[PDB]
């Protein structure tokens, strides 16, 4: 039950930097590799995430991908870089330059061949692959461009493994590039088609969490990605660890998706709390559900009170009663059934993991799949049309070899995607 983690692009590498830190702490693994934890859990399920080398060394089953060493170099240079083997630093020079066409279509493909060779080498060492996880930004040339190439080729090799990816949704407040939503559309066109599931991450919403609910002052990407990693680990650690309602991801996905083409997720983390609150807030499952249900804790700028939920996953960590959980789950559906899909009478899936989080007594994560997600796609299409009409910057991509009808096709597919949510929205 191994999981392959591929980090790609400036952000994928940066996000994954926090993710692996978290995981290492979760299992009591020293930055230089050795395990010093004290629970059976910490040892026994390393498996998934680390290769045990002699000497008690554990190496992350992951590859860091980019066309510039920069980001990866800073990681290697600093803390936790030492846990990574040289073989996980696959990069060229020069980068794409935020160009999807160069990443996917030209230049990074060349690197991708070596990336996948390494992946293959890891898949040979794997005992039992459960699946793959990619971390990247939707609008990024290497993250998404190269990432989408990797996805299409990995699924080719392994149709039956879980293909998942976590992606950053371009935020209205932070464009980089003019064609950031262009890159996103191009990737979406492939991402939808080639993955089993993808997570929607909106920085702007994450900032909202940071300050509005956590009242923190200055979010860095590391703090924001810390938040993200909490949910990523929330998801998979319970896959790893024993529990009561184990929800393998695959199973989950099964349950999450009623329709093959709608595989977008809305994660949210529950025990979000400011420090002040610590002294005032009781922690119960209903408390966690209050924070799960509340749209303000969503990690993406989509309002679940606007859209309708297809599926809701409710991840629990810690020794909760089944009654308490089940009753509260039910209570949520009793209250606002109107925001759920009509044809499924129980749209919320519990998944309780016995194992407590470190530190917290209880923890929970919300994962959903709602029609509200279409709003972000609409934002993309909106911008795209402006851009497309005047081919702004397109010449750069044209030089790479992209056709206007190719982009049009991608747009169409975006339009389809939005209509698909409309079909079940109502």
């Amino acid at each position: 039950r191994e999981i392959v983690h591929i980090q790609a692009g400036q952000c994928g590498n940066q996000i994954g930097a926090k993710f692996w830190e978290v995981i290492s702490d979760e299992h009591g693994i020293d930055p230089t590799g050795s395990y010093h934890g004290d629970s059976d859990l910490q040892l026994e399920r390393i498996n998934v995430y680390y290769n045990e080398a002699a000497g008690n060394k554990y190496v992350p089953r992951a590859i860091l991908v980019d066309l510039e060493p920069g980001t990866m170099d800073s990681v290697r240079s600093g803390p936790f870089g030492q846990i990574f083997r040289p073989d996980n630093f696959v990069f060229g020079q020069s980068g794409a330059g935020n160009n999807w066409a160069k990443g996917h279509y030209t230049e990074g493909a060349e690197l991708v061949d070596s990336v996948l060779d390494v992946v293959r080498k890891e898949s040979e060492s794997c005992d039992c692959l459960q699946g793959f996880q990619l971390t990247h930004s939707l609008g990024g040339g290497t993250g998404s461009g190269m990432g989408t190439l990797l996805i299409s080729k990995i699924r080719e090799e392994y149709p039956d493994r879980i293909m998942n990816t976590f992606s950053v949704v371009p935020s209205p407040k932070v464009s980089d590039t003019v064609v950031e939503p262009y890159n996103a559309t191009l990737s979406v066109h492939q991402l939808v088609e080639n993955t089993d599931e993808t997570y929607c991450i909106d920085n702007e919403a994450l900032y909202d969490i940071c300050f509005r609910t956590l009242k923190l002052t200055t979010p860095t990407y590391g703090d924001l990605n810390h938040l993200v990693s909490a949910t990523m680990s929330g998801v998979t650690t319970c896959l790893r660890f024993p529990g009561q309602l184990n929800a393998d991801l695959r199973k989950l996905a099964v349950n999450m998706v009623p329709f093959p083409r709608l595989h977008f997720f809305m994660p949210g983390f529950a025990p979000l709390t400011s420090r002040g609150s610590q002294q005032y807030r009781a922690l119960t499952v209903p408390e966690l559900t209050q924070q799960m249900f509340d749209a303000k804790n969503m990690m993406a700028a989509c309002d679940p009170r606007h859209g309708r939920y297809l599926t809701v996953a409710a991840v629990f960590r810690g020794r909760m009663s089944m009654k308490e959980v089940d009753e509260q789950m039910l209570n949520v559906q009793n209250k606002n059934s109107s925001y759920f899909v009509e044809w499924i009478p129980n749209n919320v899936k519990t998944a309780v993991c016995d194992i407590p989080p470190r530190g917290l007594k209880m923890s929970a994560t919300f994962i959903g799949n709602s029609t509200a997600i279409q709003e972000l796609f609409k934002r993309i299409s909106e911008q795209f049309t402006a851009m497309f009409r005047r081919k702004a910057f397109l010449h750069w991509y044209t030089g790479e070899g992209m056709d206007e009808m190719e982009f049009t096709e991608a747009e169409s597919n975006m339009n389809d995607l939005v209509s698909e949510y409309q079909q079940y929205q109502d």
Binding site: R1, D40, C128, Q130, P242, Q244, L245, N246, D248, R250, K251, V254, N255, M256, V257, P258, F259, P260, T311, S321, M322, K323, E324, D326, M329, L330, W343, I344, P345, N346, N347, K349, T350, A351
Partner: protein, 428 residues
């Protein structure tokens, strides 16, 4: 004189965890196997170590891992501890075919070896959930194969039935529709158990406001042991399980007995206590003590069997029966008149250290065939149809090679299942 218990799926194994604990309780069986002195569930070695005759199947190692790292791991042998690797994904198709088919040969052989190791195989009992993959699908696979090989042995199933309101998986109604049919087809008896009813009992009768499956299964196991452990042990009116088949099922397609348990008393409650046979059996006819959320009131009754432990006298039992006849509100079918089998085991009812039930001096369970069960299936039926109308989630099985008609077919089989109660209740 022996029987084998099979635990498939998480729920099956978690109940099994309680079951072997209980059998250790019943005789004071040490982890090493010491136990003097009962070989219906255990087989003895020359070391003096007795081991259970049971099979645990989980297609992910995780649950069995807990068994192999838990107490009693000395009592269990790897032979019984079946682990797969990879997952059946909540779908009957893989559970029954794609994945299960790979492991089932191992499993079947292990069963066959144990069967060969038994002397006087009465049959077997299987614990599972109706809604899962493995629990259902794999189970289904297994039951078909067991019906081929062990044709004339008892086939008892203990199936957990999803609460209409609480569900943890969206395709549970889809899986259960496939399951049910096949189950019926090969089973001799299937018990339905509804987690919500049991939760209600835990909070209302046991007064426990924080039940987990571990304590819920303690209840179930206690009941089950009273049903089976006890029946092979000697009593005042020693009844066997094959006798229950004969005396439980009036119809060829009989068969879905409902059990209740009624002395389900909190420690505190038990101080005051005095529950006579009559009092206990009154509690057995309360909806609150049903074990399945159904309501006896509106169904008809066909067989009603009462299973006794401890301090019981036949005369008083008969008086309690007369009380039941008097108190009727028991819409018995005209097909059968009076058909209420009693079995009485002298052995006192047991209590588990770790449980929360007070020691009772006498204990009675009630087995019953009623038409009210169909209501539970109707709830499911509508859920099934809704999903199938959209064909939601179907691709998870179609990619696995399932045919749409197969699912619609299975629903039609469910209709026939509902018709079984219609038929029976209908005619008189």
């Amino acid at each position: 004189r022996e029987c084998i218990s099979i635990h498939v799926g998480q729920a099956g194994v978690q109940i099994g965890n309680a079951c072997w604990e209980l059998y250790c309780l019943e005789h004071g069986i040490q982890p090493d196997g010491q136990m003097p002195s009962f070989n219906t569930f255990f087989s003895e070695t020359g070391a003096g170590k007795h081991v259970p005759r049971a099979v645990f199947v989980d297609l992910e190692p995780t649950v069995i891992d807990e068994v192999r790292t838990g107490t009693y791991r000395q009592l269990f042998h790897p032979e019984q501890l079946i682990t797969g690797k990879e997952d059946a994904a909540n779908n009957y198709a893989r559970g029954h075919y794609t994945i299960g088919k790979e492991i089932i040969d191992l499993v079947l052989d292990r069963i066959r070896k144990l069967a060969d190791q038994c002397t006087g195989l009465q049959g077997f009992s299987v614990f599972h959930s109706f809604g899962g993959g493995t629990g259902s699908g794999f189970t289904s696979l297994l039951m078909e194969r067991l019906s081929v090989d062990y044709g004339k042995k008892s086939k008892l199933e203990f199936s957990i039935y999803p609460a209409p309101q609480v569900s943890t998986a969206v395709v549970e109604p889809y899986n259960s529709i496939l399951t049910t049919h096949t189950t019926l087809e090969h089973s001799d008896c299937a018990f339905m158990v509804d987690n919500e009813a049991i939760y209600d009992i835990c909070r209302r009768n046991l007064d426990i406001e924080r039940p987990t499956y571990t304590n819920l299964n303690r209840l179930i196991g206690q009941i089950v042991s009273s049903i089976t452990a006890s029946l092979r042990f000697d009593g005042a009116l020693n009844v066997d399980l094959t006798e229950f088949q004969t005396n439980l099922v009036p119809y060829p397609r009989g068969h879905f007995p409902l059990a209740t348990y009624a002395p389900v008393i909190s420690a505190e409650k038990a101080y005051h206590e005095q529950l006579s046979v009559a009092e206990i059996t009154n509690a057995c006819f309360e909806p609150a003590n049903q074990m399945v959320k159904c309501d006896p009131r509106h169904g008809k009754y066909m067989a009603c069997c009462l299973l006794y432990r401890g301090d019981v006298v036949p005369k008083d039992v008969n008086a309690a029966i007369a009380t039941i006849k008097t108190k009727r509100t028991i819409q018995f079918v005209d097909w059968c008149p009076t058909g209420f089998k009693v079995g009485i085991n002298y052995e006192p009812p047991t209590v588990v250290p770790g449980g929360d039930l007070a020691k009772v001096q006498r204990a009675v369970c009630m087995l019953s065939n009623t038409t009210a069960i169909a209501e539970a299936w109707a709830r499911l039926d509508h859920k099934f149809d809704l999903m199938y109308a959209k064909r939601a989630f179907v691709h998870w099985y179609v990619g696995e090679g399932m045919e749409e008609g197969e699912f619609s077919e299975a629903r039609e089989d469910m209709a026939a299942l509902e018709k079984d109660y219609e038929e029976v209740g209908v005619d008189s």
